Point group: D2
Chain length 383, copies 4
């Protein structure tokens, strides 16, 4: 039953994903020295200023002027003829520090893996459409621009200044992907490149090697780079702030995504840590037999680490009844907040990368390493 | 089978909304001198500062320093131990004024109606779930703390500083409406009101005579601020950020959401303007009997008028098989970008009411009026 | 009786003189549209931000983002490889606007050329050592860098990025300048120029044509460009704010300079307008006979446009007694504040230039046009 | 012959000083972890904001956000209708941390004592004009509103908000000391005190028992705030600015002043450090009988230890003909830059007391101690 869904992934580059980078990048050293830190990181960016604002609390003492500077080096904005160089661009910073004690915090927490957390409604999903478990669109969006960040940096094309937007559409007939409608990839590029050669370059080294031609029709629209030219890119003309690029980070479109800001929270801010657990259970369910597609919802108000809701659903997919799914899950991996810190050893430095390419997708994440998966087949049956 | 859900909200007090309000307020005040300006602003607010940074094209001159200022005025913030006073509140303009022809990022159509925007994805969702064709957990969340305001200006309960977060937690059975499981208010109270004291006048006056009394279980969990001492609130401690609470700005958690910029953009920018129109399509596709819970996707590509993908699920409940109506929409809801503009009488200041309390929700703004409805039933067949 | 005094003039370029430029440059259009405006203009500059802050009040409505941008074009900071380009450098702005009425102002003013002004102690001086009336050092400081801004811009040397510091020393034996000890001129320059050629270039096209060799010894030290190289210049590594480069603007060293911020005040701020009158009388006295060297002091508290003090002194120079000097002066050109606005027609746009090269010195200033000069000889005698 | 003078001052309340205070406070707090850091900061303050922007080299980590904050605390600003509260006051770091070797601008000597700085000019001036060898119009200005503070913390007159401008207006005859002509206080008063009411407790308690009563004419003009309603004061309306009140920071108006950076620089930067030392030379060259009103110039050139010009006028009154003592100084006051450092025991936090109320003025800081004095009299001849 015919559908053609779409998704956008923007690469590190597009100002919102810069922010995400500075944000967590203050967070990583402010964690590496003190993983018990509470930190958030609302970076604003545009034109000449990276404002790294927000509130911290660690033993650690992170330098911000270079953290900020440095990842703007890293993603590659270096002379003005692009649009803000890493190095004559002010970092200002308005980080409110409270002091590092334990007691009157924004909750109070006391036996360790009980009693805790804050307000937000975090969904999870994984599904079998893909080789690893993410909906087919955001994958062949994210991947696409991830070859863009391979094929600038290494020296393959010398010309793709890295603010790249990349959209993709899949002709959803049934359960499977029969077709894939239009690949929209715009990429910023030097004054060197006449468009016909970019129109050519993109399709060799960025697109064709990562779109599986077995789907690729003779209906499928290449829309590479459509508005004239792109030279000035990154904040030079536009404005960009922390992670309101929030769909692209977690199932581009397909995620019931219950209000939630991803990068730059330490892991006691539940909107993030708790929601990774919502992935860890969903995938862990899916590839292990118990259904063709799994989604969870988990939800907390402030305080009660006894979680206010577990809305598991499959949409006509399940192995046992919809109820026994829930049943198994609950007994198997507790999602009280300081609980999920523990399950997958979170506060040690895995962050710069969660900003930029896929917050879950690359098989090296604590939330992504499917493990207590094959331990689900056994209580369903041996499957 | 049965489910629980949750849907948060924040008042005109929560930093993120206060910011968002200001950005819509500059959008708005830019339109009063003319509507045809492209204009996006983004604020960041916290502590002692609001920076209204953005890129504006317009012949309007509006002095942002006033607009920021009496907007924070309209949120009640005066004697500073209420978080930040809107008299000392610093104000920084970083809005880049471009006049009506040399921008980076323009290029266009021939008649008005064939133009094209920048790219992305948008959805909208209806349901006679409750009154309006909102999925009324976000709505009973919202409505509940629509009353925090009513109170402040109406004198009656006096000590409420502006902030309100909230979660309604409904349980749901597979049809229409079962019972409340939990409901919470966090208002930031006066210094003067005793903790237990506050709870009750809340109970017997904010919460109940909003939140619809038929469903009241002997186990409806009632969290009036399990923290209590919400007092240094407002724009302190958590920072502002324009255009972040997108979910509670759009459809409980019940929304399939696109990445994106609801507040702070003129109705060219099809981030917002497609996803307003996708309630014009949704409410209507319910309102005329032909389903009972649509969600139509729209997407667009930059440098194209003809959109790239449009899909109206029907979570069951379709009173026409399917590709019939998805021609009907194609027949009389011109999804071409500038088309929408003219469809939704969108070029007017209208907008500062948006940032507040659902964009679609309230019966006023043209995005929920049942205009094109019986014109479908008699069209998809003649019934 | 031997002395060797020094002075520094920095060119437009050195961050403090940038500021001075942005400052008055907001002031000129905010005057051109409304000369009755009160405006001040504390621009901060460093690295990536020009902050143009301060308070205004006009009918006018000056754009600031381009004013700010534009004079950073003007003095020539254009690609990053210098240190902040005019155009990916944020201008932010925090200009506090009051509204344009007349009554409760920071004084109250009522018949026109009476009753008025504010607190400050403004000295004036002119003397005969120079062709026009300024002490010999600041002249052969200012002039020097003013050939630097001729010999970059025009295309003579293609290489002097314009943040130039220039110091000069005069062997003061008696009343006259018998000698001139050391010309210290550092100038910023491309990676093109090996120093020996700069060491050569400077002495042809910048120094020798403007130091009168008739003084120039074979003792006189050229100190051109001494710390290694200068490439990055202007705010790129240092920080710069409005007119605290305050000696160089008014008799580099030799001015009793009674506390006072020059650029970017409109002319009801007495520290500036009133003090120009302190020049208009001193020069007007000097070249017209009545003494070899004249200095005045004038001084006001807030309010009483009847000026609290007139400390005229010559230091053993006078034609009549020191007293009759005062006597003539008083009868001749009144220095109540709204008085001196009038004498020399000040509020019409002469400002961008008062920041940068000499606040008095170039023979086209209202304060500098000596006129009621020859009308002093007559009441002394016919001399 | 006779003269009038004037000398202003501002308290720890006037914006410019409040800023200056903070910048010296960061300088200071940077020295506590080590003295050898080059460090310059500059603040800008106003309304809701303090940005401590600057360039620091140091191994110290000091968190500016605290230092700015409890400094504005120490200026008394709390309940916001007193101008700006120092709890909501936003704080922005733009201090560029460089570690101990690759800077733009270093290059140096071989022993410590032959090093060189950046360039400029400095003067210092003594007189047993009144007690200390200050020209005590700035001093009776200063001293007078040194008492505004004494009062606030001592409880007695309570309603004084922190701001004080002031002008003493002395008349002078050609020798020692004649009569007061005028004296004014602008304090910013409470909302509560009646205008006439305030004047008198001012009169009979701030002004008199500072300002030395012998000289009290039947015509000493007494301006207690001819404006009266000074109330919205502090850092509002006129902006802050680090390092601007240089005259009232240095020598009435009676100072020959060099351009420059008294507050906010470590004692390398011979802006400040030469002009502290030129009171060590001045006070001393008076203190040992050999003149009664010196002013020695020093200057330096960048890339030279040996200074470029040094001159000790004697406005008459020289008890040694001249070039004799100007060898003596050359003999035992090593004016070579790092020399001074070691001469003036300058590498210590000392400094936040400086920004307040004369740099030289008070008998404590080594810049007014009569160390080398009788060691001259017996040296310039043996008397």
């Amino acid at each position: 039953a015919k559908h053609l869904f779409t998704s956008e992934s923007v690469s590190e580059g597009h100002p919102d994903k810069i922010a995400d980078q500075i944000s967590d990048a203050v967070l990583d050293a402010i964690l590496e020295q003190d993983p018990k830190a509470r930190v958030a990181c609302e970076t604003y960016v545009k034109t000449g200023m990276v404002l790294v604002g927000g509130e911290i609390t660690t033993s650690a003492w992170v330098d911000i002027e270079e953290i900020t500077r440095n990842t703007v080096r890293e993603i590659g904005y270096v002379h003005s003829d692009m649009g803000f160089d890493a190095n004559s661009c002010a970092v200002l910073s308005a980080i409110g520090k409270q002091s590092p004690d334990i007691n009157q915090g924004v909750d109070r927490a006391d036996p360790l893996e009980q009693g805790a957390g804050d307000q937000g409604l975090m969904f999870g999903y994984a599904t079998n459409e893909t080789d690893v478990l993410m909906p087919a669109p955001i994958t062949y969006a994210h991947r696409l621009v991830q070859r863009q960040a391979e094929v600038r940096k290494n020296g393959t094309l010398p010309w793709l200044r890295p603010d790249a937007k990349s959209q993709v559409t899949f002709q959803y007939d049934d359960g499977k992907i029969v077709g894939i409608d239009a690949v929209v990839l715009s990429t910023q590029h030097s004054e060197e490149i006449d468009q016909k050669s970019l129109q050519e370059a993109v399709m060799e080294e960025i697109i064709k090697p990562i779109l599986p031609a077995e789907w690729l029709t003779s209906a499928t629209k290449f829309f590479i780079n459509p508005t004239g030219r792109f030279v000035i890119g990154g904040p030079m003309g536009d404005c960009g702030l922390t992670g309101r690029k929030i769909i692209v980070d977690t199932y581009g479109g397909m995620a019931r995504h219950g209000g939630g800001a991803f990068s730059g929270k330490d892991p006691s801010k539940v909107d993030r840590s708790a929601a990774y657990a919502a992935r860890y259970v969903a995938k862990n369910i899916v590839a292990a037999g118990l259904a063709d597609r799994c989604e969870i919802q988990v939800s907390y108000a402030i305080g009660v680490a006894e979680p206010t809701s577990i809305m598991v659903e499959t949409f006509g997919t399940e192995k046992v009844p919809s109820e026994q799914l829930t049943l198994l899950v609950r007994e198997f991996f507790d999602l009280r907040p300081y609980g999920l810190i523990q399950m997958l050893d979170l506060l040690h430095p895995i962050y710069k990368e969660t900003a930029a390419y896929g917050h879950f997708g690359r098989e090296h994440f604590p939330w992504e390493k499917t493990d207590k998966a094959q331990l689900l087949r056994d209580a369903a049956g041996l499957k």
